[PDB]
């Protein structure tokens, strides 16, 4: 698999028993207590040596992965973000203020507020947006059957009793739009690629729940990428559009038995699982048609896992309790409901819903499941730890992160599309543009970075070579 992608996750943040605290201050402590160099364009905003961004957004600490090229790397650097958040909070506890800061990789307080886990995908600019919209809406409406993180409470305000597949569904209100904080659209239309806008669209997806499960994050990014390849190539000839897709989004979420039927415009009546099976079958045909059996292993793995998950969801979803967040969480919830005869309104069930996402290794419920061997993993912890400080090798995040590690004292600022150097003696800053996501890689600049012992030597060697190393 090769598609430039990334995940931005806003974390919930709680500072109990500190009347002097506010969410912006606590988010700043988290970002600042971890780190490094500033963001290039007054909130705390840091670029890390793994190429990630750590910053305060809307009174939430937010982690954005480096650009990666495949869904396994998306999982890996996204999981490293969880470790960075947990460590950041632990370091903030040693600041003079002494705050115990709790962080949650979820999307709602169950009281009407929501915050986002966004996926970004690089696409051909030429692909017509009307096709992007009409083929993605039904996919996004239904992919929560394996992407959902689970939620106790129905309706944005949480007043309805019961369990649902996703946290985000109740907050989406329209099909298409610019918004990210209110009246949220199934398809967000912002197109800000931080790359050659003549070549690339950046698809900014906002509808997904943050996932703890690595299998869920892998499927979320990997299946979406496969659907994007079909959309770009004009491969989908059928009409998957449904009547009232916003209503369908909510109704699919609110039926964890997975029997609710969408009403397709072409007359078909299909469950969300059934409609997902139609996308999967087209993806299989697409890959066979394009590559034969010359398919890369990861594409094959995504297709196989997508199919197995849908087959098991249709048979008995509880056999997925080691793979999907909403199933793993529901298994705990129903266990307590059976053991202690609890209605869905019980406060203990609300606590399980939230604490599932706590980043602490010793207290977060997903993390306890992993500790007891009750969750399947995709990557191992040693690789996650390495990904906290090393960038991916095959995107421009390589140059960004390695510059920060090796020449941090001489980096004035950095962003997705530039690194800005502050060289000794020069009374002027050197801005090195990194405009192509698939340049600035180890194959392009690794040897050069190895040889240079100073940022001055590096900027000298890069001078006039922008259209070699970076564009």
């Amino acid at each position: 698999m090769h598609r430039v992608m990334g995940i931005e996750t806003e974390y919930g943040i709680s500072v109990p028993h500190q009347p002097n605290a506010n969410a912006m201050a606590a988010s700043s402590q988290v970002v600042n207590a971890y780190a490094q160099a500033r963001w290039d364009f007054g909130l705390a905003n840091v670029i890390l040596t793994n190429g990630a961004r750590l910053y305060v957004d809307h009174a939430h600490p937010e982690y954005s992965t480096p650009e990666v090229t495949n869904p396994r790397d998306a999982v890996l650097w996204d999981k490293a973000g969880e470790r960075i958040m947990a460590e950041a909070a632990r370091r903030a506890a040693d600041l003079p203020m002494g705050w115990t800061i709790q962080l949650y990789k979820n999307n709602t307080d169950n009281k009407g507020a929501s915050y986002g886990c966004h996926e970004n995908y690089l696409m051909n600019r030429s692909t017509p947006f009307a096709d992007i919209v009409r083929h993605l809406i039904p996919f996004f409406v239904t992919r929560q059957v394996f992407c959902g993180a689970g939620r106790v409470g129905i309706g944005a305000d949480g007043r309805g009793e019961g369990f649902q597949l996703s946290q985000r569904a109740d907050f989406f209100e329209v099909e298409v739009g610019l918004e990210t904080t209110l009246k949220r659209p199934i398809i967000n239309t912002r197109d800000e690629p931080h790359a050659d806008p003549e070549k690339y669209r950046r698809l900014h997806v906002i509808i997904g729940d943050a996932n703890m499960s690595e299998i869920a994050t892998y499927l979320k990014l990997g299946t979406t990428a496969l659907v994007l390849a079909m959309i770009e190539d004009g491969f989908l000839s059928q009409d998957f559009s449904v009547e009232s897709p916003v209503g369908a989004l909510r109704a699919v979420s609110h039926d964890p038995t997975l029997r609710y039927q969408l009403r397709l415009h072409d007359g078909r009546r299909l469950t969300a699982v059934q409609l997902q099976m139609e996308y999967l079958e087209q993806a299989r045909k697409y890959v066979e048609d394009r590559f034969g059996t010359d398919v890369d292993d990861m594409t094959r793995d995504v297709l196989d896992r997508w199919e197995t998950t849908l087959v098991r969801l249709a048979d008995d979803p509880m056999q997925l309790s080691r793979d999907l967040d909403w199933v793993a969480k529901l298994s705990i919830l129903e266990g307590y409901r059976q053991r202690e005869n609890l209605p869905w309104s019980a406060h203990k069930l609300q606590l399980v819903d939230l604490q599932y996402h706590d980043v602490r290794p010793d207290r977060g419920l997903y993390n306890r499941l992993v500790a007891r061997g009750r969750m399947n993993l995709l990557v191992d912890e040693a690789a996650v730890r390495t990904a906290m400080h090393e960038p991916p090798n095959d995107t421009r995040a390589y140059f960004r992160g390695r510059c920060l590690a090796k020449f941090g004292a001489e980096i004035a600022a950095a962003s997705w599309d530039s690194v800005i150097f502050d060289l000794p003696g020069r009374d002027s800053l050197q801005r090195v543009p990194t405009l192509e996501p698939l340049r600035g890689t180890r194959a392009h600049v690794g040897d050069l970075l190895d040889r240079c012992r100073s940022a001055t030597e590096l900027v000298a060697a890069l001078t006039g070579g922008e259209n070699l190393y970076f564009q």
């Binding site: 809307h58 009281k111 507020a113 966004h118 990210t180």
Partner: peptide, 28 residues
């Protein structure tokens, strides 16, 4: 359930106060 005993061991104290106090600013 062995696992429910593990979850019981780690759940936040004052569960009702904890849930009531978990109030977040809207994000994206």
């Amino acid at each position: 359930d062995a696992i429910l005993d593990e979850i019981d061991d780690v759940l936040e104290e004052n569960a009702e106060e904890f849930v009531r106090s978990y109030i977040q600013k809207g994000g994206e």
